Design a binder for this molecule. Structure first.
Ligand code: LMN
Ligand code: 3PE
Lengths: 82, 48, 90, 106, 85, 50
């Protein structure tokens, strides 16, 4: 049940990263870091807020901030070196 | 003869236990289904 | 005086094969439970809870997602964008 | 609800096992704990001479409610036991021969 | 590792009851001694020694199994029943 | 259910022929965790309070 909780929190974040990744490939037309960062300063700010909001909800899910933070301490059922 | 083979194989040549055996399907699935599927892979890769 | 004919000699019908021994102890409670769950629709009746869920999932939710879908047809392009450029067509 | 008897004995012994175990996980120190446990014992020693059923049941469910207020979030469990963390790590599989279902292949 | 025996449980419970104050004597203690009658313990002192015995063996007892161990031999057999030490 | 009573399946905490409830899988062992130390309305208040 603890592995279930961990994966479904991470999958909540995975869904918001799929949203953000669809907007990445829509706005810039590519996924490469080099092309997106070369044209990032030109793009509209509202799009930029929407993208980084979705990617931050992904990062907030895996890097365990308050919105879903339980699964770290519900991952002590796995052993010590894990 | 088919019933006398397989019923005796389930309850108990009968009184052996070896590994080498060919189920009825493995003749025309490893030697026709599998190479035609590898042939489908090879023609998709070079047709690309 | 009308009986089907004497030259029939009809015999019993088997399904044939090997008596596979029971790999499962069936539970009476689990079988009655699952038979009640799969055939739920023949004992379903409308109540206030049914009316609430039937209102909200068959009528209210399609109307809400409908209004949202028809308002937002040609609003948004984000395809190539700039600062100070509106993205809504309207 | 009843004077000196085996069922009242079972109830009061169960409540005393509780109050000791319940006090056990609040307190980290040994010294403060064993002081407190001697006090708890003195509370049970001051009672247990009550004759009527009325005041007996009154103090009984009053100390049951007093026992309910001091409940702890995680009781100290030994790990190999059903509250614990070692519970059901490798439960050994029961020795079973293979049941077969097909006349023809395994 | 560390595996107990029967005599280990014996000399743990005997030394345990030798530590306890409200016993009658430190000399009348046997394997077959009743905690209630032979040791002179109350209805509630047998519970305190069941608490100390369950803390001492590191094991947890439900209420249905705690009252049943009236004599010391029943306690030794019961504590030897479990795999945990 | 208490864990120390002997069941048929210790992991399910369920005897062999025991009638299964109206909406069983919310009352399963595989169900939610279902905390018992706070009343849920109270815990709602404490969470929103912090
Ligand atoms: C706003 C309020 C509007 C009023 C409507 C509520 C409505 C329609 C809901 C259908 C929705 C249509 C869905 C379409 C979707 C929209 C696009 C639901 O009426 C149902 O309400 C349920 C809960 O209240 C009851 O369920 C269970 O009850 C208990 C049994 O044990 C349990 O205790 C409970 O736990 C269950 O839940 C039902 O008994 C009741 O029929 C009708 O209510 C009204 O109609 C009639 C007919 O029946 C009712 O029947 C009466 O009851 C008999 C004694 O009962 C009498 O002898 C008899 O005189 C008469 O027959 C009335 O009572 C009245 O209320
Ligand atoms: C900038 C904005 C910041 C926003 C921050 C606020 C975010 C709050 C939203 C949190 C949402 C968390 C993700 C919800 C899905 C997580 C599913 C899950 O983790 O299920 C866990 C559950 C087992 O957990 P449990 O049994 O309780 O404990 C086990 C430990 N022994 O596993 C199971 O029991 C499996 C069966 C239940 C699975 C869930 C079924 C219902 C799913 C509902 C999803 C709702 C999604 C939309 C949420 C809207 C929130 C507003």
């Amino acid at each position: 049940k603890s592995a279930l909780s961990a994966v479904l929190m991470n999958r909540f974040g995975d869904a918001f990263f799929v949203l953000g990744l669809c907007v990445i490939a829509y706005v810039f037309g590519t996924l490469n870091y080099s092309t997106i960062f070369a044209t990032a300063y030109l793009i509209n700010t509202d799009l930029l807020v929407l993208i980084m909001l979705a990617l931050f909800i992904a990062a907030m899910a895996k890097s365990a901030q308050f919105g879903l933070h339980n699964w770290l301490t519900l991952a002590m059922e796995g052993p010590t070196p894990v | 003869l088919k019933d006398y083979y397989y019923n005796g194989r389930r309850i108990l040549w009968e009184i052996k236990r070896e590994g080498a055996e060919k189920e009825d399907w493995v003749n025309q699935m490893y030697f026709l289904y599998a190479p035609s599927l590898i042939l489908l892979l090879i023609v998709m890769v070079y047709k690309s | 005086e009308l009986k089907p004919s004497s030259a029939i000699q009809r015999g019993p019908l088997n399904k044939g094969g090997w008596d596979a021994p029971h790999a499962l102890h069936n539970d009476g409670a689990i079988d009655r439970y699952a038979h009640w769950r799969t055939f739920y629709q023949e004992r379903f009746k409308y109540t206030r809870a049914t009316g609430k869920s039937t209102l909200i999932f068959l009528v209210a939710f399609p109307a809400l997602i409908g209004y949202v879908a028809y308002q937002s047809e040609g609003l948004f392009e984000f395809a190539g964008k700039r600062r100070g450029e509106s993205v809504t067509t309207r | 609800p009843v004077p000196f008897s085996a069922a009242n004995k079972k109830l009061v012994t169960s409540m005393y096992r509780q109050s000791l175990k319940l006090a056990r996980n609040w307190i980290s120190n040994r010294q403060l704990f064993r002081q407190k446990a001697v006090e708890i014992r003195h509370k049970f020693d001051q009672n247990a001479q009550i004759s009527n059923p009325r005041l007996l049941a009154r103090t009984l469910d009053e100390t049951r409610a007093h026992l309910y207020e001091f409940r702890h979030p995680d009781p100290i469990v030994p790990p190999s036991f059903p509250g614990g963390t070692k519970y059901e790590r490798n439960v050994p599989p029961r020795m079973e021969k293979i049941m077969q279902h097909n006349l023809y292949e395994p | 590792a560390h595996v107990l025996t029967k005599d280990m449980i014996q000399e743990r419970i005997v030394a345990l009851l030798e530590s306890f104050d409200k016993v009658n004597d430190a000399k009348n203690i046997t394997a077959t001694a009743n905690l209630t009658s032979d040791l002179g313990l109350d209805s509630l002192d047998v519970v305190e020694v069941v608490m100390a015995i369950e803390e001492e063996f590191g094991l947890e007892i439900p209420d249905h199994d705690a009252d049943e161990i009236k004599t010391v031999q029943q306690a030794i057999d019961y504590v030897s029943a479990q795999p945990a030490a | 259910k208490n864990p120390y009573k002997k069941y048929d399946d210790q992991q399910d905490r369920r005897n062999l022929e025991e009638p299964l409830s109206v909406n069983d899988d919310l009352y399963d062992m595989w169900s939610p965790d279902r905390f018992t130390h706070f009343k849920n309305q109270d815990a709602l208040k404490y969470f929103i309070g912090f």
